[PDB]
């Protein structure tokens, strides 16, 4: 924005002029635990003194070593895990293909519509989000198939939620009853809940079906936790929001260390040993350890859930007074609050979603839209309930603003 | 390396037992400035006080603005440039492919055998050092073609450095005169002096031939300077070892940030204009600024040259007593010590190198090998002479022991 | 049955032991005109006298030249065509991808599920029915996206031809809305009716929705008349079962020369010159087979014979219920067998029994996707045979309803 | 060219006006048996009355079977074989990619620069012929690598045969000693003598040394003789000009059915196992007998060595003929601006081709400075001498400089 950024602590952002802003984008999930958090600043700085950089290849450092343990330990499920480290969720998704393809000796990758696994040649190929248009830069990474994601808002007449999971599971089956063998596809990468596609969840009835087909045909079941991890959902991992799921392979990046360039691939021991190198960094390891501690100490996973239920209840009543709110998809501090021209037609109102970004930003609170009309509500999980209401307030006048036909551009 | 590192500073590494070593490796030249340099340590620690992360698209930031100017000034050439961020050497090289293809509307990439470019599907594919970067993970990025790089030691009886360039240039042109059309190759991509090849420099004549070729046929000329720039070589960058060449694109990762995971694409203003996650990081740019400071303040480039030159003559003297050091190729504090059985046959001595490197470790110097038998000598540029004299002395005796066979596994 | 065929004529495979069979075969279109039609034979025989082969990339020759012009006028639309000569269906469909990639400047190709466009590395990618065919041969041609063909049988609880087209065109756009760029998409290949996947036709709305999307976004609109052309559907071309749709590209094989290895790519003048660029005998066979379809009026014959046979194939369904669905457009149908018309679950068991019952009673008939018996006799077929083949199949429905048919 | 044809017999061609020409192009060597040989015409005649085409994807027929036991035996090597049929030499190598990939389980195919494997996306990635190249139709089929072919004419001053074999093999490995996992390469497909590349034979040592390598790694060693087969070369297959090499997979085409669309993949049984036209098959049935009975393997060897000699004496006077390659009635005759720089002289190649055709011999250029001497193998000595004089004159009517474009 025209006036550029200075410092920030928890939820308050401060730019060059001293202007105060309430945060809700939280850097596409990273700011899980606020900005400049004292234990994580202390850990950064105290580590930078000891050793800035050495690589997991040739030498061990301690914190990355202490980190690895804590990440196999915290990981979803009980099977013996192992972590590989990366720089970004972007490069950890690449790895998930490398691993998948190695263990299974297989080529094809089934990734999703609506999804955004990243920005390197492999993770850019796996994605398919609105803005995320890989124009001019093809050909992409070969042997990748896409499959639709269970849309819940936009449906045929009289579909139950049981029906969605049947109709989208049918769509998912469709290439495997055609051109894609099953004994050839090495991996299904799924967002348990989609980020960029508009804070969309898949029904459990669906994921289980997908988590069976994967298990029945030997195709690795990988989950992308870069955006929806570390309490964001109200449980510690988005995958846990479903009953009994043990991902073969999982990615996390971004959030892991309050925005320091770190990432992990957490999967099964036998999967993690089909390559062996060269087919980690200390300060962000130290930061990771510091954020992990904060997640556990401040009851943050719970704060994610308790504030998460509350905010749902605030967007529900607020939808009642402003019929433009077409859907509200909250699971944790984790909203998908999407605007529509009419509630019958459910047509996007990207016009109305951008105006609300303008009112928000101009009246002391920062938020953004995903694919056009859905506002992504992903605030830092240490937002004092106070600050949150002042966000909700402004988000509310802004609704009425655009309703009464107030702010222009 | 059978170890855990406690702490480090400059060109010394301290293990947890308390032992010290000269870091002759410099951790794949991520450390030209050394470990934990004061100005970097206070760059990291002060900026973490203020901002840990926010991507340069919602609010932009103070050092994310500064380094993004300060990077473009200092590139090789006169011509307007913009610079895009990332984290790794790898992920910047993905971006090269991208910027190249986009600009041109073309499809193919040309890369060299024996170069490492990274471990993301893009960069991973262009490489040609170790075979594990394909194995079990195919297919690789489409439309990529590996040519040979010039070797100036393993020559056919009596080739003058002209014959090397012209024979390798001829072996260069062959894909274009067979299956590959010059009008769909977006870019050559080439490390000015290879790393994992064996610190191997292409002749001037080879470079201008390839360079003109690129401009004649609309192919962009790209350089990987991850290993070889930032004072490494003798001049600030490795291209300035050649008469007026100007990169269309250029990458650096690694030593951009005294070890931190930040990285830069530097394209010619035109190439960059088509498009533009932990990338840009405020702590990291802070770190990176400080280390350019030091390259200037501490005279690191002019020093790199002189210490480099000195380090070359002691090996040239060390070659003379010792029959085994086949090639000593070196530019700045940056050389390769390819040991061989006999100096006529020119046949790899993988054994003698390991023997050299092991003994060195159990004598207070950490050096490592490449392509079997080549001693990778790329220390921190800040190295004090006394230590530079000490590593040098240790390695001299290493040579003496092997010739006696006084070394064993 | 390791069935060794010695000689043939019209709609009569006769083997080596002296047996007589009623063809209605398949493995894609092949026998539109008929077996060893005196017209065709004579032309090959006498063309053989003159010329075996001299590749047109050197000298030119008369039959090729007549059949370049012949096909260029007689292929649907107004726009000047030019026509490029492949050896088989495969190397016409491989060339659509060339032809579209060269003209548009765009890499991506959009093709259908349950389709089959050819067996070489280009077209095999495009295809999508035979899982067999795409095992242990990766990687295939890069940039190719698959979109589900319209299924008018297995609907959702009482939906309309209008509901289907939307639902199926939504899916068609899902790619374009996520990861595929419409402006980097060279073309969509589409069989106007899927051959090797159960004789299945897009509703009218779906074709105009796609065609309209194609043209607006700069994507060429490809048709495949490999299986479905040459008066099979009852019009000269399957695309002419739809309204004012002139292809940008069009592939034909098989019966182009009654069987003699010939295929054509027939697009627009401009499109066909994008690249920097046909057997004498095969072309004389073809040039005859083209006169036959006009002369014996086999386009007109199919339509009538076909609808007649539709009502015939449909009262069979109200006595014998196992037939879920009767699909027929001209002498071009696919009779589809199920457990129960509420479950619609394939009963491929019953089907391979009818093919065996019928193989024992002088009538060869091979199956699609297990349960779907494909129905593609040679169009020359006389009514006494058609009925002598149609009565049999009915007798079979009786027999497989009994468990009289065992293996 | 701008010319329409009407009839041809054996060696001789005739356009619709009546100007008689002589074949040397020979339909890119699809006409080995000669044009409209009676046994072949009588074969298509007979069988087209019997069956045009019924679909092979299902049940069987007799001409195919007879051919598929015939070919199967006349293959090179003593190991058991199985054949697979296509419509063209292009789709046949498309199978060679496929088959290799099923058997081995590996992706990477390795093909040679200057290679002509054909024109579908499979054998057009394999291919490496410049004037046959694949602009605006990329992306091409992944995991195809192009190692360079031994050119035994452009050498660096004073290299033995052995040297070229050492060096091009040292090029061969450079992929594998760097980015290409040898244990993940499905097959090396090679033309033994490169057709469209310029009539270029691989040295004895180099072929062995690849066969060796390939054998050492489970890399299926493959051969395309779409061009160079059926006795074009003086031996039956062109491979038998080498020492005890058994192909894992071979590709036959073109002159299989005297030009009628017919292809073949002749493989070791073991390789084909675990993964066609009734008229054209009959056509090949006869064309094989004509090769056999009219005794052509040997005629090609005999006329081939007469053709070689005369040409080497043509070079003694005309120093524009910089290289004379020849193996059977099969040769490249490379035109150069200079006996010592060896610069391609296209310009002249153009005019040579212009003269010759003006005087009733057909002949064309390979990479625009190599004349593709490849007549039908039943060209009588008479005609063969008529061309050799009409070519002889051409070189001198360009030495004097008369021919115009």
UniProtKB/Swiss-Prot annotation, chain A:
Name used for this protein in its record: Isoleucine 2-epimerase
What Pfam family does this protein match (any one)? Aminotran_3
- Name the catalysed reactions: L-isoleucine = D-allo-isoleucine
Detail the relationship between temperature and activity.
Answer: Optimum temperature is 50 degrees Celsius for the forward reaction, and 45 degrees Celsius for the reverse reaction.
Q: Its function?
A: Catalyzes the epimerization of L-isoleucine to D-allo-isoleucine and D-allo-isoleucine to L-isoleucine. Can also catalyze the racemization of many nonpolar amino acids, including leucine and valine. Does not have GABA aminotransferase activity.
Q: Which cofactor does it need?
A: pyridoxal 5'-phosphate
Q: Which PROSITE patterns match?
A: AA_TRANSFER_CLASS_3 (PS00600)
Entries under CDD domains matching the protein: OAT_like
Q: Which residues cross the membrane?
A: none
Q: Which family does it belong to?
A: Belongs to the class-III pyridoxal-phosphate-dependent aminotransferase family.
Q: Mind telling me which InterPro entries this protein's record contains?
A: Aminotrans_3, Aminotrans_3_PPA_site, Class-III_PLP-dep_AT, PyrdxlP-dep_Trfase, PyrdxlP-dep_Trfase_major, PyrdxlP-dep_Trfase_small
Q: Which residues carry this modification: N6-(pyridoxal phosphate)lysine?
A: 254
Mention one GO molecular function: identical protein binding
Q: Does the keyword Isomerase apply?
A: yes
Tell me how this protein assembles: Homotetramer.
The effect of pH on activity is described as:
Optimum pH is 5.0 for the forward reaction, and 6.0 for the reverse reaction.
From Swiss-Prot, chain B:
EC number assigned by the record: 5.1.1.21
Q: Does the keyword Isomerase apply?
A: yes
Q: What cofactor does this chain's UniProt record say it requires? A: pyridoxal 5'-phosphate
The record's InterPro entries line, in alphabetical order, gives:
Aminotrans_3 (IPR005814), Aminotrans_3_PPA_site (IPR049704), Class-III_PLP-dep_AT (IPR050103), PyrdxlP-dep_Trfase (IPR015424), PyrdxlP-dep_Trfase_major (IPR015421), PyrdxlP-dep_Trfase_small (IPR015422)
- Residues binding pyridoxal 5'-phosphate are 89-90, 116, 224-227, 277
Detail the relationship between temperature and activity.
Optimum temperature is 50 degrees Celsius for the forward reaction, and 45 degrees Celsius for the reverse reaction.
Name a GO molecular-function annotation.
identical protein binding
Please name every pair of cysteines joined by a disulfide bond in this record: none
On pH dependence, the entry says: Optimum pH is 5.0 for the forward reaction, and 6.0 for the reverse reaction.
Catalytic reaction(s) noted: L-isoleucine = D-allo-isoleucine
Q: Which UniProt keywords apply?
A: Isomerase, Pyridoxal phosphate
| N6-(pyridoxal phosphate)lysine found at | 254
Quaternary state and partners of this protein?
Answer: Homotetramer.
User: What family is this?
Assistant: Belongs to the class-III pyridoxal-phosphate-dependent aminotransferase family.
- The protein's role, per its UniProt record: Catalyzes the epimerization of L-isoleucine to D-allo-isoleucine and D-allo-isoleucine to L-isoleucine. Can also catalyze the racemization of many nonpolar amino acids, including leucine and valine. Does not have GABA aminotransferase activity.
Name of the molecule in the record: Isoleucine 2-epimerase
Organism whose genome encodes this protein: Lentilactobacillus buchneri
């Amino acid at each position: 924005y025209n006036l550029v950024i200075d410092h920030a602590h928890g939820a308050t952002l401060v730019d060059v002029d001293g202007n105060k802003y309430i945060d809700l984008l939280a850097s596409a999930s990273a700011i899980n635990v606020g900005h400049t958090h004292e234990k994580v600043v202390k850990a950064i700085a105290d580590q930078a003194q000891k050793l800035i950089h050495y690589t997991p290849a040739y030498f061990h450092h301690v914190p990355g070593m202490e980190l690895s343990e804590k990440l196999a330990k915290i990981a979803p499920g009980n099977s013996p895990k192992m972590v590989s480290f990366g720089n970004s969720g972007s490069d950890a998704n690449d790895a998930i293909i490398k691993f998948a393809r190695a263990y299974t000796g297989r080529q094809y990758i089934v990734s999703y519509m609506g999804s955004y696994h990243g920005s390197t040649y492999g993770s850019q190929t796996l994605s398919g989000s609105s803005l995320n248009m890989t124009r001019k830069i093809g050909p992409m990474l070969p042997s990748v198939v896409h499959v639709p994601y269970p849309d819940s808002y936009r449906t045929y007449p009289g579909e139950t939620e049981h029906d969605v999971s049947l109709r989208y599971f049918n769509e998912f089956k469709k290439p495997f009853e055609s051109f894609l063998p099953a004994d050839e596809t090495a991996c299904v990468l799924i967002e348990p809940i989609q980020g960029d596609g508009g804070i969309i969840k898949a029904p459990e009835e669906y994921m289980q079906l997908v988590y069976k087909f994967c298990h029945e045909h030997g195709i690795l079941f990988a989950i992308d936790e870069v955006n929806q991890g570390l309490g964001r959902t109200g449980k510690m991992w988005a995958i846990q929001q479903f009953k009994d799921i043990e991902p073969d392979l999982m990615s996390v990046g971004k959030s892991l260390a309050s925005g320091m360039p770190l990432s992990a691939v957490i999967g099964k021991k036998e999967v993690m040993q089909s390559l062996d190198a060269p087919a980690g960094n200390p300060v962000c390891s130290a930061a990771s350890l510091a954020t992990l501690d904060v997640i556990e100490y401040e009851g943050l996973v719970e704060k994610s859930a308790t504030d998460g239920a509350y905010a749902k209840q605030r967007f529900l009543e607020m939808q009642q007074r402003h019929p433009m709110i077409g859907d509200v998809r909250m699971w944790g501090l984790n909203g998908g609050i999407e605007l529509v021209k009419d509630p019958k037609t459910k047509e996007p109102d990207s016009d109305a979603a951008t105006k609300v970004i303008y009112y928000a930003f101009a009246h002391g609170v920062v938020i953004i839209t995903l694919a056009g009309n859905i506002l992504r509500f992903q605030p830092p999980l240490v937002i004092p309930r106070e600050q949150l209401d002042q966000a909700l307030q402004v988000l509310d006048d802004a609704f009425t603003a655009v309703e009464n036909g107030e702010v222009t551009i």
